[PDB]
Symmetry: D6
Amino acid sequence: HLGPQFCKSCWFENKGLVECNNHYLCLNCLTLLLSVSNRCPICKMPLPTKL
Amino acid sequence: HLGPQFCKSCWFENKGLVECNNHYLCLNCLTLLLSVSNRCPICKMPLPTKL
Amino acid sequence: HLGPQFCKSCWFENKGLVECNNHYLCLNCLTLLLSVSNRCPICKMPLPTKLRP
Amino acid sequence: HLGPQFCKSCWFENKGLVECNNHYLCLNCLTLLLSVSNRCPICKMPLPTKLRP
Amino acid sequence: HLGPQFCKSCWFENKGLVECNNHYLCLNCLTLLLSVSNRCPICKMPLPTKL
Amino acid sequence: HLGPQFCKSCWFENKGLVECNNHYLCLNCLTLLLSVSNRCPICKMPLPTKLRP
Amino acid sequence: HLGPQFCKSCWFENKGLVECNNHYLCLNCLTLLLSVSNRCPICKMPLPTKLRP
Amino acid sequence: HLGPQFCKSCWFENKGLVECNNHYLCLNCLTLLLSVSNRCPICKMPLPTKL
Amino acid sequence: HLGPQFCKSCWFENKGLVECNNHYLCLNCLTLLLSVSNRCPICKMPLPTKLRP
Amino acid sequence: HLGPQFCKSCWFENKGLVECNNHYLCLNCLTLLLSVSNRCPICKMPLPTKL
Amino acid sequence: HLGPQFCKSCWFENKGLVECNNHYLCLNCLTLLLSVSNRCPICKMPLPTKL
Amino acid sequence: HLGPQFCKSCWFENKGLVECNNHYLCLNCLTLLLSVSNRCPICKMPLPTKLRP
Ligand SMILES: [Zn+2]
Ligand SMILES: [Zn+2]
Ligand SMILES: [Zn+2]
Ligand SMILES: [Zn+2]
Ligand SMILES: [Zn+2]
Ligand SMILES: [Zn+2]
Ligand SMILES: [Zn+2]
Ligand SMILES: [Zn+2]
Ligand SMILES: [Zn+2]
Ligand SMILES: [Zn+2]
Ligand SMILES: [Zn+2]
Ligand SMILES: [Zn+2]
Ligand SMILES: [Zn+2]
Ligand SMILES: [Zn+2]
Ligand SMILES: [Zn+2]
Ligand SMILES: [Zn+2]
Ligand SMILES: [Zn+2]
Ligand SMILES: [Zn+2]
Ligand SMILES: [Zn+2]
Ligand SMILES: [Zn+2]
Ligand SMILES: [Zn+2]
Ligand SMILES: [Zn+2]
Ligand SMILES: [Zn+2]
Ligand SMILES: [Zn+2]
């Protein structure tokens, strides 16, 4: 499944993590990414609309 | 620059090509990709809004 | 076998997926690909023309 | 550009070679490939259908 | 063993497949390859003389 | 040297880009990264803290 | 998981090793790294600041 | 062109070298390879019939 | 362990194969290699000089 | 030659850099490495005895 | 664990092998390596002081 | 051509280096290697037996 418990965007936050398709994202990173597009630049798949 | 003159999505069309960021896209492919998101799944950068 | 359930062409669609040889394809993408050739540009093998039973 | 002058399908024929997109193909191999699809299994791009001037 | 059931030369035929050393070959491809040499250009090992 | 002018973190922003060590970063991304550490997770070198003359 | 028990920074120390995220670090190396940043240059993830129970 | 002047089969002989397609072959190696097939196992292309 | 039973030097012979360290060698190839050195050019380890019981 | 001007051990210091064999080292890192052995763990070659 | 039973330095000796950290070393090679530094050039870790 | 002037076997010696085929070797290492075989374990080609004019 998903690797180690860290936001694959900022490689630092381990709490308040949302499950992206094959990796994790912290809330702050997820927000900024949703701000810019519906598609994740890390895994090329759609971003979580949850939380 | 960009490689050989072919739509990097369908690898077939060579005419009516729009310049994506580091590759090409035919009009049909570009449309279907814009239909789904503003971000290109091939190069992870924004899709051309031109044409 | 086949990876996460997303169209490997558009990396977005997750429902209405047809099984290509080692990946998936949504109907819209599959249609456009068949429009151009019987051979898939992603896996080099023949595109699914039929959904079976 | 294109590599040594040999059919990239059979790696043997060196005369009567047609230019595929980034490699060569002998007539026999090209014929057999066109028999199966318009798309080349070696370079994923369209097979040469015409030899030009 | 051998991978997916397809002629590794033409990547299309799935019926009437002969077992080459670590891959498959359709009858038409096998014939053309035997026409040219006893050694397979795909796996570098000897071609099947069967069928 | 540095590649195409896009923020290597969000791969979208192309204006208001700051030069990180071997890539670019938009202000929003850079701000969020500085919030977390002085070291860039993309290139492992220190984040730009100052824009120079 | 984590590899052979040696500090991945100095590849020499094998006792007094702290667990970084996917490797080890001796106290001396860890100290010097914390001196420079909270983020590890070897694995790009945060340096261990605390040894736990 | 061809790399360093050594038989790519035995990696030892540097004299009496025949030019194979993208490498070299000493006379002894070339003979043994021709003994077995017309196709070179190193470069997958036809063996030199010269010498 | 060792792969398909073919001489890794000539990729053709499948009978009368001697076990080199991580691959096979036919007698003819092995003979020619011993003629040149005690060390195998394919696996960098010593050539089999003896077949054992 | 050597790459970007940063200590290849700590990837942070850019001043007071000593030239190791194919990379750089800051004074603090060089000291700690010399403390432990004469051979550099980054490039496998001998450490600078200068400074 | 360690791979095949051969000195990873000279790739020839299989007897009188000392266990280095993730490979083997024959006595002669180990001596010459210790002669030059305490750190192994093959695996970057400390050399065996045993034997 | 050949890289930095260090014995590729012991990665330490930089003087008294003999030119092997695509790298260097110090006399001590070369001697030990010749002791074992005429073929170099590093580059798979023959060891230098003679230094020329
Ligand atoms: Zn984050
Ligand atoms: Zn994602
Ligand atoms: Zn297209
Ligand atoms: Zn694109
Ligand atoms: Zn799709
Ligand atoms: Zn497919
Ligand atoms: Zn051909
Ligand atoms: Zn082609
Ligand atoms: Zn076929
Ligand atoms: Zn075959
Ligand atoms: Zn950004
Ligand atoms: Zn950076
Ligand atoms: Zn350490
Ligand atoms: Zn770490
Ligand atoms: Zn030879
Ligand atoms: Zn050849
Ligand atoms: Zn053989
Ligand atoms: Zn061998
Ligand atoms: Zn440093
Ligand atoms: Zn160094
Ligand atoms: Zn040894
Ligand atoms: Zn070692
Ligand atoms: Zn040496
Ligand atoms: Zn050598």
